[PDB]
Amino acid sequence: GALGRKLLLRVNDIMHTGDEIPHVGLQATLRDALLEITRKNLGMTAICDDDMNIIGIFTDGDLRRVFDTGVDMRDASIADVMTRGGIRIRPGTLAVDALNLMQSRHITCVLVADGDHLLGVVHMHDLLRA
Amino acid sequence: ALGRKLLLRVNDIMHTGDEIPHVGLQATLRDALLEITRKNLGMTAICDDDMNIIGIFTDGDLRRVFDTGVDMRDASIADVMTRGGIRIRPGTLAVDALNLMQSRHITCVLVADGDHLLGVVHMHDLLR
Numbered sequence: 001g002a003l004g005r006k007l008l009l010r011v012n013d014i015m016h017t018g019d020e021i022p023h024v025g026l027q028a029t030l031r032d033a034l035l036e037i038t039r040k041n042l043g044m045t046a047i048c049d050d051d052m053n054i055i056g057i058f059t060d061g062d063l064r065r066v067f068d069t070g071v072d073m074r075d076a077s078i079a080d081v082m083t084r085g086g087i088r089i090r091p092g093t094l095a096v097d098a099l100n101l102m103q104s105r106h107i108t109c110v111l112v113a114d115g116d117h118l119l120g121v122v123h124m125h126d127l128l129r130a
Numbered sequence: 131a132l133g134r135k136l137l138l139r140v141n142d143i144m145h146t147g148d149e150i151p152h153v154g155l156q157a158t159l160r161d162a163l164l165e166i167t168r169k170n171l172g173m174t175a176i177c178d179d180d181m182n183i184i185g186i187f188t189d190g191d192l193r194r195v196f197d198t199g200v201d202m203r204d205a206s207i208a209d210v211m212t213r214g215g216i217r218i219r220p221g222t223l224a225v226d227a228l229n230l231m232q233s234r235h236i237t238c239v240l241v242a243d244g245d246h247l248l249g250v251v252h253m254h255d256l257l258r
């Protein structure tokens with residue numbers, strides 16, 4: 001009942017915004033990106049330009065995948081290891097459709113955007129709270 | 131529909147057998163991450179020869195150890211795993227598994243009888 005009602009909300013009204021958005025710049029180090037991931041507690045970070053347009057994203061899963069090189073990755077830049085672009089939805093998207101997208105793509109956090117402009121982020125956990 | 135899927139026991143939806151991610155106590159961190167990738171659930175158990183759970187390791191745990199700045203390439207899983215872990219019984223309802231995952235801030239959970247690993251359920255599994 002409550003979950004069903006929450007899934008009829010627009011993501012605009014449940015997404016993380018402002019300082020709760022994980023994002024770093026294009027010149028960030030991988031360690032910078034990891035700190036941002038840890039602090040914002042969503043398992044991922046965006047990589048944005050100065051206008052808050054999405055350049056890329058990096059998840060905890062991405063770290064596992066890039067770690068599978070023999071070389072020492074500790075001083076890598078984020079620009080070299082990020083996923084370019086990122087899966088996103090419009091702010092009027094219903095939570096149910098965000099869930100369906102996340103299920104079909106096997107991701108747990110989706111960017112909320114107007115074109116390339118990052119407005120917020122929604123995590124699967126957000127769709128089941130409140 | 132939503133109400134029915136949420137009322138299933140996790141026994142009926144969990145991954146079992148070869149689909150369970152596990153490595154042994156002597157595995158390397160690289161062995162552990164290979165198993166995580168191969169089984170596609172973002173985590174692995176660490177088990178003894180009787181399939182008893184010693185610990186777990188998740189993609190989040192990799193971030194936490196990597197961000198210590200120590201070179202982790204040659205690490206052993208025994209030195210970086212989380213001992214113990216959160217588990218549920220096979221009769222746990224999907225809705226209760228979801229609430230547990232929410233409360234513990236996790237997206238995948240082991241299904242066990244005591245320490246005996248029976249299966250694993252991902253948040254994705256619960257929401258088909």
Ligand SMILES: Nc1ccn([C@@H]2O[C@H](COP(=O)(O)O[C@@]3(C(=O)O)C[C@@H](O)[C@@H](O)[C@@H]([C@H](O)CO)O3)[C@@H](O)[C@H]2O)c(=O)n1
Pocket residue numbers: 041042043044060125186187188189190191212214215216217235236237238239240
């Ligand atoms: N069945 C499980 C699953 C996980 N864990 C442990 O719970 C801690 C958190 O698990 P996580 O998967 O690493 O949790 C994260 C985290 O570690 O940051 C992942 C991250 O991508 C993001 O999803 C955040 C948000 O906090 C979600 O609320 O949550 C880890 O030490 C992990 O070993 C456990 O004991 N038993």
Ligand SMILES: Nc1ccn([C@@H]2O[C@H](COP(=O)(O)O[C@@]3(C(=O)O)C[C@@H](O)[C@@H](O)[C@@H]([C@H](O)CO)O3)[C@@H](O)[C@H]2O)c(=O)n1
Pocket residue numbers: 057058059060061062083085086087088106107108109110111170171172173189237252254
């Ligand atoms: N809004 C998003 C979110 C993620 N991604 C990209 O989609 C890929 C998958 O995201 P993930 O979070 O890394 O997905 C994982 C993965 O490793 O692919 C994480 C893992 O812990 C586990 O949750 C598995 C599922 O078990 C697979 O069903 O799913 C990554 O390259 C990520 O950059 C994206 O483009 N846009």
